[PDB]
C-alpha cells in the first residue's frame, strides 16, 4: 500500500510476522527508543532452511507499507543491519544469519535455539542520514505512535503473551507493556492499562438499528436486512469525569486488525459527547465482517451507513439512563 518510513510501521510489520508465524510469545526489546536496537523474539514456526535466502526477496495490513522493498525484512535490510536467528520444527539445529544492505546473507552459522525466530534491527535508518536525523529529533512522537500500535496488538491478541521493554543507554531495562496470555480482550486491557482503567468501562451491547436512527441515515427495513456486522468491545461510561481528556486510548479493529475507520471513529466520539460534552472515551472496538465486504482507496465497507446506524443505536442504548 502506502509507503512510509515510521518506527511504528516497522515494529508493526515485525509483530505481524510473528503473529502470522503462529507465535504464542512475542517479546520486544528496544534500546534508545528503537534508535539503537529493535529486537523481536517469538516462538513461532521459524524459518525453513530452504527459504533462508528467500527471507529478503484484501489486506488491512497493507494499507501502509514500510520501506521500498515491498516486505518487512527486505525493506529493513536496506535501512539497517539485520540479524536473524531461527529454527523450524523440521530443523535439527537453528541458524543465525547476518544480512548486508542488499539483503544478501553475509553469514550463516549453526545456532542451537528453540523453535521460533528472533529478528534484530540495528541502527535503523543509518543508511539514510537525513531520515535518520529526523527519526532521532522526532523520537518522542515516533515512539508514542509505535507504542499506540503495540497497545492495539496487545489488546486484541488474547492467548498471546506480548512484552516490551526499552533501555536508555546503559540504564536499566524499563517496562513498556506486557500481556499475560489471557483469553479475553477485557483481561488484556487490564494488563495493558491497569485494572483501574477497567473500572470505568462498560461492554458494547449490539442492538438492531432503531427506527429513528435508520431515518437519519436513509435506511429502510429492506436496507437493515443484510446486516452482517458484529461489533464487540468496551467503551467508557458517559458518566461525568469518567472519560478521558483526549483520544489517546481509542482502538478500532476490523476482523481483529488494528486500523483507523474515520467515520466510525467520528461517530463514536460525537455520540459520546451527546452525553459527556467535555471528555473523550476510552475505546476498544472490533468490527467483525465478511472480509469480501472490505476495501481500500482509506477503508471502505459495504453498507457503512448500516454499520454506523448500528453503532449509534447501540451506543445510545448503552448510555441511556
Curated annotation (Swiss-Prot):
Changing residue 18 to N: In LYNCH4; strongly decreased DNA mismatch repair activity. Changing residue 69 to W: In MMRCS4; decreased DNA mismatch repair activity. Keywords: ATP-binding, Disease variant, DNA damage, DNA repair, DNA-binding, Endonuclease, Hereditary nonpolyposis colorectal cancer, Hydrolase, Nuclease, Nucleotide-binding, Nucleus, Phosphoprotein, Tumor suppressor. Changing residue 32 to E: Normal DNA mismatch repair activity. One of its GO terms (biological process) is somatic recombination of immunoglobulin gene segments. Its main location: nucleus. ATP binds at residues 17, 42, 71-73. One of its GO terms (cellular component) is nucleoplasm. It is found in: Nucleus. Changing residue 283 to I: In LYNCH4; uncertain significance. It is linked to Lynch syndrome 4: A form of Lynch syndrome, an autosomal dominant disease associated with marked increase in cancer susceptibility. It is characterized by a familial predisposition to early-onset colorectal carcinoma (CRC) and extra-colonic tumors of the gastrointestinal, urological and female reproductive tracts. Lynch syndrome is reported to be the most common form of inherited colorectal cancer in the Western world. Clinically, it is often divided into two subgroups. Mismatch repair cancer syndrome 4: An autosomal recessive form of mismatch repair cancer syndrome, a childhood cancer predisposition syndrome encompassing a broad tumor spectrum. This includes hematological malignancies, central nervous system tumors, Lynch syndrome-associated malignancies such as colorectal tumors as well as multiple intestinal polyps, embryonic tumors and rhabdomyosarcoma. Multiple cafe-au-lait macules, a feature reminiscent of neurofibromatosis type 1, are often found as first manifestation of the underlying cancer. Heterodimer of PMS2 and MLH1 (MutL alpha); this interaction is required for the stability of both partners. Forms a ternary complex with MutS alpha (MSH2-MSH6) or MutS beta (MSH2-MSH3). Part of the BRCA1-associated genome surveillance complex (BASC), which contains BRCA1, MSH2, MSH6, MLH1, ATM, BLM, PMS2 and the RAD50-MRE11-NBS1 protein complex. This association could be a dynamic process changing throughout the cell cycle and within subnuclear domains. Interacts with MTMR15/FAN1. This is Mismatch repair endonuclease PMS2. The lineage of its organism: Eukaryota, Metazoa, Chordata, Craniata, Vertebrata. The gene is PMS2.
Amino acid at each position: 500500500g502506502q509507503v512510509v518510513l515510521s518506527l511504528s510501521t516497522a515494529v508493526k510489520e515485525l509483530v505481524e510476522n510473528s503473529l502470522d508465524a503462529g507465535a504464542t510469545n512475542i517479546d520486544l526489546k528496544l534500546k534508545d527508543y528503537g534508535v539503537d536496537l529493535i529486537e523481536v523474539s517469538d516462538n513461532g514456526c521459524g524459518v525453513e532452511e530452504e527459504n533462508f535466502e528467500g527471507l529478503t526477496l484484501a489486506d488491512l495490513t497493507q494499507v501502509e507499507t514500510f520501506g521500498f522493498r515491498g516486505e518487512a525484512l527486505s525493506s529493513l535490510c536496506a535501512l539497517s543491519d539485520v540479524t536473524i536467528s531461527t529454527c523450524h520444527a523440521s530443523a535439527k539445529v537453528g541458524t543465525r544469519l547476518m544480512f548486508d544492505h542488499n539483503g544478501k546473507i553475509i553469514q550463516k552459522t549453526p545456532y542451537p535455539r528453540p523453535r521460533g525466530t528472533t529478528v534484530s534491527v540495528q541502527q535503523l535508518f543509518s543508511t539514510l542520514p537525513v531520515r535518520h536525523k529526523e527519526f532521532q529529533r522526532n523520537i518522542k512522537k515516533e515512539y508514542a505512535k509505535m507504542v499506540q500500535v503495540l497497545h492495539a496488538y496487545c489488546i486484541i491478541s488474547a492467548g498471546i503473551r506480548v512484552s516490551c521493554t526499552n533501555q536508555l543507554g546503559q540504564g536499566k531495562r524499563q517496562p513498556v507493556v506486557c500481556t499475560g496470555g489471557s483469553p479475553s480482550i477485557k483481561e488484556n486491557i487490564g494488563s495493558v492499562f491497569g485494572q483501574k482503567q477497567l473500572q470505568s468501562l462498560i461492554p458494547f451491547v449490539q442492538l438492531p438499528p432503531s427506527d429513528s436512527v435508520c431515518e437519519e441515515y436513509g435506511l429502510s427495513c429492506s436496507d437493515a436486512l443484510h446486516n452482517l456486522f458484529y461489533i464487540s468491545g468496551f467503551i467508557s461510561q458517559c458518566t461525568h469525569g469518567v472519560g478521558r481528556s483526549s483520544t489517546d486510548r481509542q482502538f478500532f479493529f476490523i476482523n481483529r486488525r488494528p486500523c483507523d475507520p474515520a467515520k466510525v471513529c467520528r461517530l463514536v466520539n460525537e455520540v459520546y459527547h451527546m452525553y459527556n460534552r467535555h471528555q473523550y472515551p476510552f475505546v476498544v472496538l472490533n468490527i467483525s465482517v465478511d472480509s469480501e465486504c472490505v476495501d481500500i482507496n482509506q477503508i471502505l465497507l459495504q453498507e457503512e451507513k448500516l454499520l454506523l446506524a448500528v453503532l449509534k443505536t447501540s451506543l445510545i442504548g448503552m448510555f441511556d439512563s
